[PDB]
Write a protein that binds this ligand. Structure first.
Ligand code: CHL
Ligand SMILES: CCCCCCCCCCCCCCCCCC(=O)OC[C@H](CO[C@@H]1O[C@H](CO[C@H]2O[C@H](CO)[C@H](O)[C@H](O)[C@H]2O)[C@H](O)[C@H](O)[C@H]1O)OC(=O)CCCCCCCCCCCCCCCCC
Ligand code: CLA
Ligand code: CLA
Ligand code: CLA
Ligand code: CLA
Ligand code: CLA
Ligand SMILES: CCCCCCCCCCCCCCCCCC(=O)OC[C@H](CO[C@@H]1O[C@H](CO)[C@H](O)[C@H](O)[C@H]1O)OC(=O)CCCCCCCCCCCCCCCCC
Ligand SMILES: CC(/C=C/C=C(C)/C=C/[C@@]12O[C@]1(C)C[C@@H](O)CC2(C)C)=C\C=C\C=C(C)\C=C\C=C(C)\C=C\[C@@]12O[C@]1(C)C[C@@H](O)CC2(C)C
Ligand SMILES: CC(/C=C/C=C(C)/C=C/[C@@]12O[C@]1(C)C[C@@H](O)CC2(C)C)=C\C=C\C=C(C)\C=C\C=C(C)\C=C\[C@@]12O[C@]1(C)C[C@@H](O)CC2(C)C
Ligand SMILES: CC1=C(/C=C/C(C)=C/C=CC(/C)=C/C=C/C=C(C)\C=C\C=C(C)\C=C\C2=C(C)CCCC2(C)C)C(C)(C)CCC1
Lengths: 198, 154, 208, 42
C-alpha cells in the first residue's frame, strides 16, 4: 500500500513509493522522465514550503487582529502601509539576497554536494545530506529527518498550496480576508456559500 | 491619447454612431404591431446594440475620428486586454492542439500499419491523450531541455 | 451461469441472439439493434440497466405513492412535475451542489468497482467492515443487504434478480409514462387513472 | 456495434462530429458574451 489517489486505479510505473508523499497521483503523466521527476520533486518541496509560510503569514495575523491582540492590516492591502524604507529599496534588497541564496540552492540541485561548504570561512561545511533536505545549520534542533516526518511535511505543504489558492480566489471574488469569510459562513452556513457569493 | 485617438466614452462621433444605429433599428420597429414576434425580436436587437455600445465605452476602448474602436497592440499596459492576453490564450490553445496531435502521432508511430490508425482515429487512445494539453507548456519545455523535442540525426 | 436454450423468449418462435444465452437475470433474447453484442459492452449495459432500474423504481414509488396518497385526503404533496420550484429551506442550487458531491462520491465508488471488480469492498476509514457482495452490480454487505435475504443458493438468487429486473423495467416505463402524460395532459397520473377508469372507452389518448 | 464504432470513428465522421461540437461551443460562448472585442477580466 503506497496510497492510492483513486482506489480503483493502478499507480504509474515510474512512481514506486520511494519518494515521500507518493500516492500515485499523476493523471497527466508529467513525470514520465526520471529527470523531470527529480526536478519536480524539488519544485514541489520549495513551493510547498513557501506556501506554508505564506498562508501562515496571511492567516495568523488576521485571526490575531480579529480577536484583538495586534492591529495589522489585511494581506491584500498590507502593501500600502508605509515602512521604514521605500518599497523599491526593500524589493531590490530582497532581489539581491534571493539572487544569491536561490543560485546556491540551484547549484546544489544541479550537481549535489558541490555547495556544502561555506565560501568565506573554509571550515563549517554542511553535512552530506540529500537534495532538498540540507540539514546542518538549517536544522538547529536536529529533529530526526525520518521518512514519516517527510511525508507529513509534503502533505502539509500540499494543503498549504491548496489553501493559498483558496485565499487568493476568495479575496478576488468576495473582497476580504479568508478568516472574515469563514466567520461569516459560520454565522449562517446555509445562506453564505459560493452560490450566494457568486 | 495614444496615436491621437480619444476614449470612446467621451468621444462624440462614437455617440453619434450609436444614436444613428438605434434610430435605424427603431425605424423598422414602428411598422409592426407593438407586441408581435418581429417587434420583440427588433426590441431585443436594440437592447443588444445599446448594451454593446455601453460595454465598449465601459472597457475604455480608443475611438478615432471615424468614431470606431481602434486596437493598440504596441504593448501598452493600458491595452493588454486588446491583443496580448487574448494572444496568450490563443498560444495556449494552439499549443494544446498541436501538442495533442503530435503526441497522438508519436504514440501510433510504432505499429506495423500506422496509417490504419490515421484514417480511422483510435478514439480510446485519443481521449487519454487530449488531456496532456492542459500541461503541454511544461511538457514541451522539459521536452526541449531534455533534448528530445527535435529529432537529432536530421 | 446456466445457459437456458429453451427459456421463454420476447418474440416466440424466433432464435435469440448468440450473445444472449440466458446467463443474465431476466434474459428474454430482446436485442433487435444488437447493441449488447460486445462482451465488455454487454457487461456495461447490464450495469446500466440495473442502475436505471433501481433509480426508476425509487422514482416510481416517490411519484405515484405520494400522489395516490394526496388524491385521498391524507397529506398534501404537491404535483410532482412542478415540485422542483416550490422553495424549501434553502435555494435549489446549494442543495444541488451538496447533493452532487455526495452522489459523485457514491458513483465514483461504483465506477471503481465496475471497472475493477472487487477492489473497493473495504471501508477506507475502518478496514474491518467489507461489503459481502462478490458480484458487480450487487454490493451486498451490511449496508446494502442487512437482512441477507439474497445470499442463498445461486438458483434462488437468479430468480430473485429476475424479479428485480422485471420490476425495474416496469418502473422505468411507468416513470416515463407519468412524464409523457403530464406534458401531454395537464393533470396528475392519479387523475388520469381515475378519469380513464370512469370512462374507459373515451378517456384515452385520442381525446384531443 | 463494434463495426459501427469503427466506422463512426473514421476520419470524415469523426471530423464532422468534432467540428459540430466546436461550432456549438463557440456559438454558445458568443451568445452568452456577444460583441466582445477585448478581454476585460484581467
Ligand atoms: C432523475 C432526476 C430528475 C428529473 C427526472 C427531473 C425532472 C424535472 N425537473 Mg428537476 N429533475 C430531476 C432532478 C433535479 N431537479 C432539480 C431542480 C429542479 C428545479 C429547480 C426545477 C426542476 C424542474 C424539473 C422539470 C422540468 C421539465 C422540463 O422542462 O424539462 C426539460 C427537459 C429536458 C432538459 C430533457 C431534454 C432532452 C434530453 C434527452 C436531454 C422536470 C419534470 C423544473 C420544473 O419543475 O418545471 C416545471 C424546475 O423549475 N428541477 C434538482 C436539484 C435539487 C435535481 C437534482 O437531482
Ligand atoms: C481544485 C483543486 C484540486 C484539483 C485536483 C485536480 C486533479 C486533476 C483533475 C481531475 C482529477 C479527476 C479525474 C477523473 C478521475 C479519473 C482520471 C484517471 O485517472 O483516468 C485514467 C487515466 C490514466 O492515466 C495515464 O494514461 C496514460 C495513457 O494510457 C492510456 O490512455 C488512454 C486512457 O483512456 C488509453 O487507454 C490509451 O490506450 C493508453 O495510452 C498512461 O500511459 C497510463 O495509462 C496512465 O498513467 O488518466 C487520465 O489521464 C484520464 C483522462 C483525464 C485526466 C484529467 C487530468 C486533469 C486534466
Ligand atoms: C428517487 C427517490 C425519491 C426522490 C429523489 C424523492 C424526492 C423528494 N421527495 Mg419523496 N418519496 C420517495 C422517493 C423519493 N423522493 C418514496 C419511495 C416515498 C415513499 C412512497 C416518498 C414519499 C415522499 C413524501 C410523503 C414526500 C416526499 C417529498 C419529496 C420532495 C421534498 C422532500 C425531500 O427532499 O425528501 C426527503 C428528504 C430526506 C433526507 C428524508 C423531494 C423532491 C415531499 C414533497 O412532496 O415535497 C414537498 C413529501 O412530503 N416524498
Ligand atoms: C490529492 C489528489 C487527489 C485527487 C484529485 C483525488 C480525487 C478523488 N478521490 Mg482520492 N485520495 C487521494 C488523493 C486524491 N484524490 C490520496 C492521497 C488518498 C490516500 C488517502 C486518496 C484516497 C481516496 C479514497 C479511499 C477514495 C478517493 C476517492 C476520490 C474521488 C472521489 C470524488 C467524489 O467523492 O465524488 C465527486 C467529487 C466531486 C467534486 C464532483 C476523486 C475523483 C474515492 C473514489 O473515487 O473511490 C474510487 C474514494 O473512495 N480517494
Ligand atoms: C421489487 C424490486 C426489487 C427486487 C425484487 C430486488 C431484489 C434484490 N435486491 Mg434490490 N433494490 C431495489 C429493488 C429491488 N431489489 C431498488 C429500488 C433499489 C434502490 C434503492 C435496490 C438496491 C439494491 C442494492 C444496493 C442491493 C440490492 C440487492 C438485491 C438482492 C439481494 C436480496 C434482497 O434483499 O433484495 C430484495 C428482496 C426483495 C424480496 C424485495 C424487497 C422489497 C421491499 C420489501 C419493498 C418494500 C417497499 C419499499 C420500502 C417502498 C435481490 C435479488 C443486494 C444484492 O444484490 O445482494 C448482493 C444489493 O446489493 N438491491
Ligand atoms: C408502463 C405502464 C403504463 C400503464 C399501466 C399506463 C396506463 C395508462 N396510461 Mg400511459 N404511458 C406509459 C405507460 C403506462 N401507461 C408510457 C411508457 C408512456 C410513454 C409513451 C405513456 C404515455 C401515456 C399518455 C400520453 C397517456 C397515457 C394514458 C394512460 C391511461 C389511459 C390509457 C391511454 O389511453 O393511454 C395509452 C398509453 C399508451 C399507448 C402507452 C402505453 C404503452 C406502454 C409500453 C405500456 C404497455 C402496457 C404493458 C405491456 C402492460 C402493463 C402491465 C400491467 C400494468 C397491466 C392509463 C391508466 C392517457 C391518459 O392520461 O388517460 C386519459 C394518456 O394521455 N399514457
Ligand atoms: C484572423 C481572423 C479573425 C479574427 C482574429 C477574428 C476575431 C474575432 N471575431 Mg471573427 N470572423 C472571421 C475572422 C476572424 N475573427 C471570419 C473569416 C468570419 C466570417 C465567418 C468571422 C465572423 C465573425 C462573427 C459573426 C463574429 C466574429 C466575432 C469575433 C470576435 C469574437 C471573440 C469571441 O468569440 O469571444 C471570445 C471567445 C472565447 C474566449 C473562446 C475561447 C474560450 C475557450 C473555449 C475556453 C478556454 C478555457 C481556458 C473576435 C475579436 C464576433 C464579434 O462579436 O465580433 C466583435 C462575432 O459576432 N467573427
Ligand atoms: C521564454 C522563452 C525562451 C525559452 C528558452 C528556453 C531555454 C533554451 C536554452 C536551452 C535549450 C537546450 O538545452 O537545448 C538545446 C538544443 C538541444 O538540447 C540539448 O540536447 C543535447 C543532446 O540530447 C543534450 O541532451 C542537452 O542537454 C540539451 O540541452 O539544441 C539547440 O537548441 C541548439 C542551441 C545550442 C545547444
Ligand atoms: C508558493 C505559494 C504561496 C506563497 C505565498 C506567499 C509567499 C505569500 C506571501 C504574503 O502573504 C504574505 C505572507 C503576507 C501578505 O501580506 C503579502 C504576501 C506577499 C501575499 C503557493 C503555491 C501554490 C501552488 C498550487 C496551488 C499548486 C497546485 C497544483 C496542483 C493542483 C497540481 C496537481 C497535479 O499536478 C499534479 C500534482 C499531478 C499532475 O500530473 C496533474 C495535476 C492535476 C496538474
Ligand atoms: C423507459 C426507459 C428506456 C427504454 C429503453 C428501451 C425501450 C430500449 C429498448 C431497446 O434497447 C433494447 C432494450 C434492445 C435494443 O436492441 C433495441 C431497443 C428497442 C433500442 C428508461 C427509463 C428510465 C427512467 C429513469 C431512470 C427515471 C428515474 C426518475 C426519477 C428517479 C424521478 C424522480 C423525481 O424527479 C421526479 C421526476 C419529480 C420530482 O419532483 C420528484 C422525484 C422523485 C425526485
Ligand atoms: C512581444 C510582442 C510583440 C513582438 C514580439 C517579437 C517580435 C518576438 C519574437 C519571437 C521569436 C523570435 C520567436 C521564435 C521562435 C523560434 C523557434 C525556433 C521556435 C519554436 C517552436 C517550436 C518548434 C514548437 C513546436 C511545437 C509546439 C511546442 C507547439 C505544438 C507542438 C509542436 C511540436 C508543433 C509585438 C510587439 C508584435 C506585440 C506585443 C507582443
Amino acid at each position: 500500500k503506497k496510497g492510492e489517489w483513486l482506489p480503483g486505479l493502478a499507480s504509474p510505473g515510474y512512481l514506486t513509493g520511494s519518494l515521500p508523499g507518493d500516492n500515485g497521483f499523476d493523471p497527466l503523466g508529467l513525470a514520465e522522465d526520471p529527470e523531470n521527476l527529480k526536478w519536480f520533486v524539488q519544485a514541489e518541496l520549495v513551493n510547498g514550503r513557501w506556501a506554508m509560510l505564506g498562508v501562515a503569514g496571511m492567516l495568523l495575523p488576521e485571526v490575531f487582529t480579529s480577536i484583538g491582540i495586534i492591529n495589522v492590516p489585511k494581506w491584500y492591502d498590507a502593501g500600502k502601509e508605509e515602512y521604514f524604507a521605500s518599497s523599491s529599496t526593500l524589493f531590490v534588497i530582497e532581489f539581491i539576497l534571493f539572487h544569491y541564496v536561490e543560485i546556491r540552492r540551484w547549484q546544489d540541485i544541479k550537481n549535489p554536494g558541490s555547495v556544502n561548504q561555506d565560501p568565506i570561512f573554509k571550515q563549517y561545511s554542511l553535512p552530506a545530506g540529500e537534495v532538498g533536505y540540507p540539514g546542518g545549520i538549517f536544522n538547529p534542533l536536529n529533529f530526526a529527518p525520518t521518512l514519516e516526518a517527510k511525508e507529513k511535511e509534503i502533505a502539509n505543504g500540499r494543503l498549504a498550496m491548496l489553501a493559498f489558492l483558496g485565499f487568493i480566489i476568495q479575496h478576488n471574488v468576495t473582497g476580504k480576508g479568508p478568516f472574515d469569510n469563514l466567520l461569516q459562513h459560520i454565522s449562517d452556513p446555509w445562506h453564505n456559500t459560493i452560490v450566494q457569493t457568486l | 491619447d495614444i496615436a491621437g485617438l480619444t476614449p470612446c466614452k467621451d468621444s462624440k462621433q462614437f455617440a453619434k454612431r450609436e444614436k444613428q444605429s438605434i434610430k435605424k433599428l427603431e425605424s423598422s420597429l414602428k411598422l409592426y404591431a407593438p407586441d408581435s414576434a418581429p417587434a420583440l425580436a427588433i426590441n431585443a436587437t436594440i437592447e443588444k446594440t445599446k448594451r454593446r455600445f455601453d460595454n465598449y465605452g465601459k472597457q475604455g476602448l480608443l475611438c478615432g475620428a471615424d468614431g470606431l474602436p481602434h486596437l493598440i497592440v504596441s504593448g501598452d499596459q493600458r491595452h493588454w486586454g486588446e491583443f496580448i492576453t487574448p494572444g496568450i490564450l490563443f498560444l495556449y490553445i494552439a499549443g494544446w492542439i498541436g501538442w495533442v496531435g503530435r503526441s497522438y502521432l508519436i504514440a501510433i508511430r510504432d505499429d506495423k500499419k500506422p496509417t490504419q490508425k490515421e484514417i480511422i482515429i483510435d478514439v480510446p487512445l485519443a481521449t487519454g491523450l487530449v488531456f496532456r494539453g492542459f500541461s503541454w507548456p511544461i511538457a514541451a519545455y522539459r521536452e526541449l531541455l531534455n533534448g528530445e523535442l527535435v529529432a537529432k540525426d536530421v | 451461469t446456466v445457459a437456458e436454450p429453451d427459456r421463454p423468449l420476447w418474440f416466440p418462435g424466433s432464435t435469440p441472439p448468440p450473445w444472449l444465452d440466458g446467463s443474465l437475470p431476466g434474459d428474454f433474447g430482446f436485442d433487435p439493434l444488437g447493441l449488447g453484442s460486445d462482451p465488455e459492452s454487454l457487461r456495461w449495459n447490464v450495469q446500466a440497466e440495473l442502475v436505471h432500474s433501481r433509480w426508476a423504481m425509487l422514482g416510481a414509488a416517490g411519484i405515484f405513492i405520494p400522489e395516490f396518497l394526496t388524491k385521498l385526503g391524507i397529506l398534501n404533496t404537491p404535483s410532482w412535475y412542478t415540485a422542483g420550484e416550490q422553495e424549501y429551506f434553502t435555494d435549489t442550487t446549494t442543495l444541488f451542489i451538496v447533493e452532487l458531491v455526495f452522489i459523485g462520491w457514491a458513483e465514483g465508488r461504483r465506477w471503481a468497482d465496475i471497472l475493477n471488480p472487487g477492489c473497493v469492498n473495504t471501508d477506507p476509514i475502518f478496514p474491518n467492515n467489507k461489503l459481502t457482495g462478490t458480484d458487480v452490480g450487487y454490493p451486498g454487505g451490511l449496508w446494502f443487504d442487512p437482512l441477507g435475504w439474497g445470499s442463498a443458493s445461486p438458483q434462488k438468487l437468479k430468480e430473485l434478480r429476475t424479479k428485480e429486473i422485471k420490476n425495474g423495467r416496469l418502473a422505468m416505463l411507468a416513470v416515463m409514462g407519468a412524464w409523457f402524460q403530464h406534458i401531454y395532459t395537464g393533470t396528475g397520473p392519479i387523475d388520469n387513472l381515475f378519469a380513464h377508469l370512469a370512462d374507459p372507452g373515451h378517456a384515452t389518448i385520442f381525446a384531443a | 456495434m463494434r463495426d459501427l464504432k469503427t466506422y463512426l470513428s473514421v476520419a470524415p465522421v469523426a471530423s464532422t462530429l468534432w467540428f459540430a461540437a466546436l461550432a456549438g461551443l463557440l456559438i454558445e460562448i458568443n451568445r452568452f458574451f456577444p460583441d466582445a472585442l477585448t478581454f476585460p477580466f484581467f
